[PDB]
Structure formats: C-alpha cells, structure tokens
Amino acid sequence: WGYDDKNGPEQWSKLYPIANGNNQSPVDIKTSETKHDTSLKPISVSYNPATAKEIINVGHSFHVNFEDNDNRSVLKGGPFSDSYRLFQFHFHWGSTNEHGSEHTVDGVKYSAELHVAHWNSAKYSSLAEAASKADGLAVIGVLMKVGEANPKLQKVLDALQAIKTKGKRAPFTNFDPSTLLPSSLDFWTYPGSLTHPPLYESVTWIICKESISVSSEQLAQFRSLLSNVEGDNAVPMQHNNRPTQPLKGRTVRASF
Ligand SMILES: *CCOCCOc1cc(C(F)(F)F)cc(C(F)(F)F)c1
Ligand SMILES: CC(=O)Nc1nnc(S(N)(=O)=O)s1
Ligand SMILES: [Zn+2]
C-alpha cells in the first residue's frame, strides 16, 4: 500500500475492505453540529523526556518512537476512565501548503497534522493486543497552520538528515512531545480508525481545537524525506494524508 495513485487511499478498500467501514478517520468536524458533553474531563498529558528512544523512516512517513513498558508517559483525562501509554508520534502533510492535514474543520484543510499515539496500557497487556481493539488506541490530533517557523519542530526536523532513506533509523533522546501541543487542550473527540493501513477502527480521537504553526520551509523538510531505500533513486515523500471519511451517524463531542 501507499499514497501514490496506483496504491493509494482509493485502492485501499480493494485491499483492506474496512476502509469502507463505519468508523473511518480522518473526518470533517462540522462545528454547528458538535455536542458539548459534560462527562468530558480535561486531558492531562504526563510524558517523560527519557522514554524518547529513536526516530525512523518508514517510507510513507517517519515516526518518533517511545519506550512503552511502564506508564512513565501517560495520556489521562478526557473521555478516558483509563490511563493510555505514549508509544509514538508522527506527522501528515500534502503536495502543497494548502492541504497536508487529514482532519478538516468546517471544510478548512490545513498544511499538516500532528498525531500523538497511545494505547490502552491498562485494559490490554501489549500494543499488538491493543491495536485491533475499539478501546485500545487514543490519538491526539493537532492541526498545523502555515505561518511562523515552529521552534519545537526544529529539534525533530534537525534529525531527518539521519533517516533520509526508507528504513534508515536514528536514536532520539530527551524529548517531551507535550512541547508540541497548543496552549489550550480544548478538543473534540469521536470514535474512529487508524488513517492508513491496517486501518483498524480502534482509535479514540482527540482533536485539539487550537492549531500550531509550521513554516512553509519546515513543510519542505518533510518532503526532503525519501520513499525509497538507499542507493536506489530519489523519490521524495510528497503527501501522506487520507481524504476525510463519511461520519455515518457518529457523534463529535466538544469539551467546550
Ligand atoms: C513507526 C512505527 O510505530 C511503531 C509501531 O506501532 C505499532 C505496532 C503494531 C504491532 F502490533 F504490530 F506491533 C501495531 C500498530 C497499529 F495498531 F497498527 F497502529 C502500531
Ligand atoms: C505503526 C503505526 O503507527 N501505524 C499507524 N497506522 N495509522 C496510524 S494514524 N495516522 O492513527 O496515526 S498509525
Ligand atoms: Zn497519523
């Protein structure tokens, strides 16, 4: 699978059939239609800089990975009775500056999107057990708005020199990805899926209502990454965002 025209989102179904399921992400959040739910506590993020393990190039994107064998870095709060464990964060972008984000709000597409992934440390014992589970994963989504260079991006953008080709991997230590979040964690939540394959309808989505800034050049650093393996040609990572999906009667809750 991939984001190319011959293996993209459109051919995913004729491959993974859940892509035409009932709980697909990303989606468009129509604000006139959200619901303030009163049982929604705020969201508390308690990450530890020293769980920061490595950065690695997975060919369609890159990931920053964390140590996930105790609740050292947790997502607590929101719609969650349980504490969720941080294990990864990563990004999404597009061909140009006007649509790299996966979620849209009110039909407004953003330049990129930040995803911060947790699994249910406390109902399940492993993340492979957790992946298929409707209540297994929790991802925070942060819209990215083209403007000023983000300072806290740099410390990770500075690290892609060392993972330029597909499979290339580098150590990445002392990082609090909470530093990447907006000042307000006012958010929406809806039940949804993973946005690329395996596409598991197992993600409880947290979408911060506040954007963060990324600069036009920082987005270019995203596309200086290579889909290919070393020695092979250069094919750069141009986009890796899925089109929005049908809500199919799902309810998007606001925390405000
Ligand atoms: C850059 C890659 O991220 C780290 C690996 O995260 C996952 C592992 C697994 C598996 F069960 F195979 F270990 C599954 C998932 C999934 F649920 F598909 F997101 C992520
Ligand atoms: C290993 C891994 O993380 N696979 C994913 N598949 N879809 C994801 S999404 N866009 O929720 O963040 S992550
Ligand atoms: Zn993602």
Q: How close is the Cα of 68 to the center of ligand 3, in Å?
A: 19
């954007």: which residue's tokens? 211
Smallest CA separation from ligand 1 atom 20, residue: 131
Residue 90 marked in a binding site:
yes
Instruction: Give 178: exposed, middle or buried? Use CB within 10 Å, 0-12, 13-18, 19+.
Output: middle
User: What is each CA distance from 224 to 62, 165, 180, 236, in whole angstroms?
Assistant: 12, 10, 21, 6
Instruction: Give 94: exposed, middle or buried? Use CB within 10 Å, 0-12, 13-18, 19+.
Output: buried
Structural domain tally of the chain?
Answer: 1
Q: Give the integer Cα–Cα distance in Å for 112 and 121.
A: 28
Task: List, by residue number, the catalytic residues.
Answer: 60
- Which two three-digit tokens encode residue 145? 């708005």
Resolution in units of Å: 3.0
Ligand 2 binding residues, C-beta < 6 A:
88, 115, 117, 139, 194-196, 203
- Ligand of minimum distance to the alpha carbon of 114: 3
User: Is any ligand 1 atom within 6 A of the Cβ of residue 118?
Assistant: no
Print the domain residue range for 186.
Answer: 1-256
Q: Ligand 2 pocket: which of 196, 200, 202, 240 to mutate (most atoms <8 Å of CB)?
A: 196
Residues lining ion ligand 3 (Cβ < 5 A) are 115
CATH number at residue 210: 3.10.200.10
Q: Give the integer Cα–Cα distance in Å for 96 and 145.
A: 13
Q: Which amino acid is at 182?
A: P
Experiment type: X-ray
What lies within 8 Å, CB to CB, of 151 at 6+ separation is none
Residue 196 marked in a binding site:
yes
